[PDB]
């Protein structure tokens with residue numbers, strides 16, 4: 164897409180943009196543009212990459228209106244939310260990490276060992292997970308009960324194995340995990356559902372100030388909101404995060420740490436399931452790579 168193409172799309176939605184813009188291709192769902200309007204306001208544009216995304220756009224809009232009422236940190240304040248374009252004013256701080264546009268390598272915008280990141284991330288996790296189930300239900304978001312989690316993952320495994328394939332090693336791990344009763348919590352809570360450093364905004368000291376990408380939010384296993392952390396920060400950091408979260412009153416179980424590791428390891432299964440649901444071949448090919456087939 165050209166700069167002029169983006170200017171025309173934005174003008175079609177009442178947003179008059181300068182030609183000063185740069186592109187972020189990190190996301191699978193949306194191409195993002197850092198843009199600047201002729202009054203000097205910085206804008207974040209999210210342009211759907213696939214056909215048939217209208218419902219997820221309207222769902223994410225509803226999610227954001229729900230969560231902004233409950234969180235101390237900023238979330239995107241959508242002003243345009245058509246089937247063609249999503250736009251919100253840029254948030255205050257940079258994400259904790261970015262990908263290098265050329266190399267695609269992680270660029271860290273804070274010291275990853277920042278202690279403030281752990282304590283403030285614990286607080287944000289506590290606030291997200293505190294959102295009342297009644298409000299989630301009233302907003303027509305998916306609610307998974309504890310009894311739903313293992314049957315769903317088992318269905319996911321059968322579907323991915325049948326449609327794409329899975330290595331024998333990954334299958335064995337996933338089936339041990341599904342059978343390991345003590346790992347699974349007896350409660351579910353409202354979660355972000357795609358939470359990792361790429362979606363957390365912080366000042367340079369590591370104090371979390373915002374969370375961005377919200378289409379996945381629903382009630383589910385809380386460990387899902389810890390797996391992205393252990394994937395990039397490691398097991399001892401995860402242990403510290405769990406300790407800080409419990410200090411705030413976050414609901415835990417003895418095996419939350421172990422469950423989080425298995426959720427992190429289930430990333431390829433979740434990617435394969437997502438790719439199949441999109442029906443997008445390029446995505447399915449990428450998932451098949453991670454599945455070891």
Ligand SMILES: CC[C@H]1OC(=O)[C@H](C)[C@@H](O[C@H]2C[C@@](C)(OC)[C@@H](O)[C@H](C)O2)[C@H](C)[C@@H](O[C@@H]2O[C@H](C)C[C@H](N(C)C)[C@H]2O)[C@](C)(O)C[C@@H](C)C(=O)[C@H](C)[C@@H](O)[C@]1(C)O
Pocket residue numbers: 189191192269356357358359361378379387388390391394427429430431433434437449
């Ligand atoms: C550092 C940067 C890397 O991010 C991660 O590794 C984090 C830690 C994953 O979250 C991990 C951890 C966790 C908990 O998500 C936070 C888990 O749910 C997912 C499956 O895997 C991400 C984000 C996953 O994306 C998410 O995949 C979901 C299936 C759908 C979701 N979105 C489009 C709706 C999408 O953003 C997923 C599968 O790795 C994307 C594929 C394409 C990649 O391999 C890409 C190249 C990643 O390596 C990455 C972006 O470079």
Ligand SMILES: Nc1nc2c(ncn2[C@@H]2O[C@H](COP(=O)(O)OP(=O)(O)OP(=O)(O)O)[C@@H](O)[C@H]2O)c(=O)[nH]1
Pocket residue numbers: 187189190191192193194195207209252253254256257258261357361362375376
């Ligand atoms: N600084 C800054 N970067 C942002 C902001 N919103 C999005 N980004 C960047 O744009 C990228 C893609 O935007 P997302 O909304 O995550 O796109 P997506 O397609 O939903 O992403 P995934 O579902 O994770 O694949 C993010 O990973 C950030 O690097 C923002 O408000 N500020």
Ligand SMILES: [Mg+2]
Pocket residue numbers: 190191362376
């Ligand atoms: Mg994203």
Ligand SMILES: [Mg+2]
Pocket residue numbers: 344345347
């Ligand atoms: Mg049990």
Ligand SMILES: [Mg+2]
Pocket residue numbers: 190192357376377378
């Ligand atoms: Mg997203």
